[PDB]
C-alpha cells in the first residue's frame, strides 16, 4: 500500500469513526469517488486472494450485520478495533435502514488497510440484483445514484464464498450443499459471478439447518434447501473437520448450536428489524483452536 493510499484511507476511517458514541442517526457523507474507490480497491484485493480462504487463528468470527452501523461499532469495541484483533465476517452487511453505506465502507476500508488480518465472506444480501433485496439499492440511489449500486455489485461479485480456519472450521453464510462433494468445487467457482438461484454457490449462501429434516428438505424461503443433523455429521467426517460455523438466521442469544454442537449459527445484529429481541454474538478462536463466545446486547 502507498502512503498516499494510507492518507486517504485514514481520512475515511476517521470520518466514519467520528460519529461513534453519537445519538444514532448520524450518517457521515463521504464523496462519491471515496465510496467508489473503496469498491474498486477492495475488489482488486478480493480477486488476489482465493475464493476459499484458508485462515489461521487467532481471529474473531461474526454473523450478519444488516446495515446496523452502530451495532457494528459496538462489535469492534468488544472485540477490539483492527488491527488489535483479526476478523472474519460471514456476510449480509447491507440491508434496510439508511446506514448500510457506512457499514460497508468501514468494512471495505479495514479490508484494504489490513488485507491479511481482515476478511469478509459473501452473504446472500451481497447479490447483484434486486430480485429479493431492495434496501441497499434504495439507499444508494437516495444518497447518490444507481451507478453507485452497480459499482457495489461489481465488488460484491468478487467476495469470497467460504473459509476454513486451521483445517478444522468450515465457514460460510448459508450452509451446506447437496452438490458439495469436495473443497475443490468451491475453488472452481469463478469470479466475478452473481448468486444463482440454484446450485453450489446458491446453497452456500442460502441453505439452513432443520431439526425435523433427516437428510435434505425444502426451504420455506423459496430457495435452496434445508439439511439435518446427519448431513452435518457425514460432512465433518468426510473432510476431517470439527465444526461448521455459519450465519444467515436470527437466533435468540446471537449464537445457537445444532447437531450436538457440530454446527453453530452466529448472528451479530442485536434486535434485528425490531419485532425480535435478540442479542448479537461473536465467536473468538485462539492459537490453540479453542472457541469462546462473546455476546452483545441492545
Amino acid at each position: 500500500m502507498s502512503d498516499s493510499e494510507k492518507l486517504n484511507l485514514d481520512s475515511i476511517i476517521g470520518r466514519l469513526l467520528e460519529v461513534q458514541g453519537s445519538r444514532p442517526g448520524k450518517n457521515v457523507q463521504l464523496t462519491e469517488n471515496e465510496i467508489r474507490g473503496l469498491c474498486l480497491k477492495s475488489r482488486e484485493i478480493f480477486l488476489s486472494q482465493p475464493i476459499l480462504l484458508e485462515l489461521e487463528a487467532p481471529l474473531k468470527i461474526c454473523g450478519d450485520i444488516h446495515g446496523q452501523y452502530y451495532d457494528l461499532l459496538r462489535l469492534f469495541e468488544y472485540g477490539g478495533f483492527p488491527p488489535e484483533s483479526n476478523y472474519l465476517f460471514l456476510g449480509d452487511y447491507v440491508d434496510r435502514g439508511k446506514q448500510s453505506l457506512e457499514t460497508i465502507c468501514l468494512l471495505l476500508a479495514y479490508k484494504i488497510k489490513y488485507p491479511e488480518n481482515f476478511f469478509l465472506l459473501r452473504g446472500n444480501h451481497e447479490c447483484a440484483s434486486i430480485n429479493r433485496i431492495y434496501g441497499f439499492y434504495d439507499e444508494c440511489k437516495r444518497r447518490y445514484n444507481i451507478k453507485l449500486w452497480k459499482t457495489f455489485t461489481d465488488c460484491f461479485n468478487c467476495l469470497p464464498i467460504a473459509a476454513i480456519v486451521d483445517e478444522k472450521i468450515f465457514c460460510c453464510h448459508g450452509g451446506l450443499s447437496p452438490d458439495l462433494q469436495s473443497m475443490e468445487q468451491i475453488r472452481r467457482i469463478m469470479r466475478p459471478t452473481d448468486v444463482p438461484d440454484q446450485g453450489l454457490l446458491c446453497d452456500l449462501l442460502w441453505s439452513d439447518p432443520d431439526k425435523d429434516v433427516q437428510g435434505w428438505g425444502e426451504n420455506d424461503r423459496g430457495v435452496s434447501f434445508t439439511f439435518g443433523a446427519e448431513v452435518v455429521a457425514k460432512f465433518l467426517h468426510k473432510h476431517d473437520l470439527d465444526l461448521i460455523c455459519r450465519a444467515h438466521q436470527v437466533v435468540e442469544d446471537g449464537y445457537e448450536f445444532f447437531a450436538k454442537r457440530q454446527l453453530v449459527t452466529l448472528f451479530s445484529a442485536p434486535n434485528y428489524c425490531g419485532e425480535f429481541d435478540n442479542a448479537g454474538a461473536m465467536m473468538s478462536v485462539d492459537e490453540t483452536l479453542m472457541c469462546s463466545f462473546q455476546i452483545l446486547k441492545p
Partner: protein, 285 residues
C-alpha cells in the same frame, strides 16, 4: 420544545404520544421504531417531512390534517393498500418501498408529485398515474409487472426504474421524450426496440435478459452508460450501433458469448474508442 427538526431514529417508541409540545416542527423522523398505527399527529401543521421508515404500520390514516406535507416515507412497513393521502396536495416525494401493496390507486390528487417509489411490492400493472404530470422519477422495481403501458402522460419523466419484473417487450415509451435513464434489467426482454423517441437517454440498462442482438439504438447519440451484461450477444458487429455515442464511457458486456473471445476487452476498445470503463474495470491504455 423549540426545534424545526426532530429526530427519534431508533428509539423503541411503540406509540405516538404527546407530540403537541412541538410548536413549529418542520421535519419529524421516526425511523426504525415500533409504531403500529398512525395517530396523534393532527396538530403538527408545520411539517414538510414525515418519516416512518421501518415500522409496523398496517394502514395509512390520520394524515389528512398535515396538508403542508411535502415528503412522506412509509417504507418497510406492512401496508397492503394505498389510501389516506388524497389531502396532501403539496407532496413532492412519496416512498412506499417494501410493503405488500398490490395496486396503484388513490394518488390522483398529488399533482406536484416529483418522485413515486413503489419498489419491492406485489404490483402487477401500471395504472392511475396519468394525473401525475410533474412526475420525474418512477420506481417500480421488484414487482410483478408484466407490460409497459399507461406511461404516456408523464412527458416530464426523466428516470424510469423497472428492474426485476416480468416484462417481455419494450413498448409504451413513445411519449417519454425527456427520458434520460432507463433500467430494465432482470426481465424477459428478447429484442431491443421501442426507443425511437428517447433521444435524450444517457443511461440505458437492459442487462440480465435474453437479448441476442444490439439494434435500434444508433439514434441514441447521448448515451453515457450502456449496461448489457448477462445476455446472449454474439456478434462484434453489433457494436456499430453505438458508434454515434461520442460520450459513451461505460459498457457492461461480461457473461455474454462475446466474452468467450480472448480479445474481448481489445475488441470493445477498438469499436468504442471513447469508452473508459468496460464492466468493472477501467481501460488502462
Amino acid at each position: 420544545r423549540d426545534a424545526e427538526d426532530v429526530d427519534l431514529n431508533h428509539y423503541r417508541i411503540g406509540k405516538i404520544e404527546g407530540f403537541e409540545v412541538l410548536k413549529k416542527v418542520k421535519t419529524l423522523c421516526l425511523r426504525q421504531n415500533l409504531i403500529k398505527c398512525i395517530e396523534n399527529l393532527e396538530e403538527l401543521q408545520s411539517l414538510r417531512e414525515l418519516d416512518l421508515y421501518d415500522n409496523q404500520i398496517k394502514k395509512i390514516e390520520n394524515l389528512e390534517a398535515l396538508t403542508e406535507l411535502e415528503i412522506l416515507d412509509i417504507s418497510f412497513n406492512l401496508l397492503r393498500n394505498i389510501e389516506g393521502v388524497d389531502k396532501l396536495t403539496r407532496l413532492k416525494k412519496l416512498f412506499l418501498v417494501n410493503n405488500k401493496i398490490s395496486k396503484i390507486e388513490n394518488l390522483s390528487n398529488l399533482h406536484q408529485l416529483q418522485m413515486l417509489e413503489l419498489g419491492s411490492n406485489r404490483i402487477r400493472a401500471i395504472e392511475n398515474i396519468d394525473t401525475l404530470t410533474n412526475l420525474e422519477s418512477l420506481f417500480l422495481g421488484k414487482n410483478k409487472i408484466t407490460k409497459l403501458q399507461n406511461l404516456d402522460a408523464l412527458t416530464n419523466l426523466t428516470v424510469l426504474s423497472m428492474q426485476s419484473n416480468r416484462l417481455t417487450k419494450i413498448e409504451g415509451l413513445q411519449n417519454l421524450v425527456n427520458l434520460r435513464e432507463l433500467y430494465l434489467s432482470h426481465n424477459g426482454i428478447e429484442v431491443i426496440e421501442g426507443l425511437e423517441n428517447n433521444n435524450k437517454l444517457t443511461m440505458l440498462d437492459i442487462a440480465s435478459n435474453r437479448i441476442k442482438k444490439i439494434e435500434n439504438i444508433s439514434h441514441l447519440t447521448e448515451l453515457q452508460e450502456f449496461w448489457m451484461n448477462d445476455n446472449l450477444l454474439e456478434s462484434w458487429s453489433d457494436l456499430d450501433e453505438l458508434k454515434g455515442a461520442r460520450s459513451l464511457e461505460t459498457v457492461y458486456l461480461e457473461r455474454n458469448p462475446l466474452q468467450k473471445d480472448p480479445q474481448y476487452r481489445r475488441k470493445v476498445m477498438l469499436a468504442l474508442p471513447s469508452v473508459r470503463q468496460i464492466d468493472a474495470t477501467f481501460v488502462r491504455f
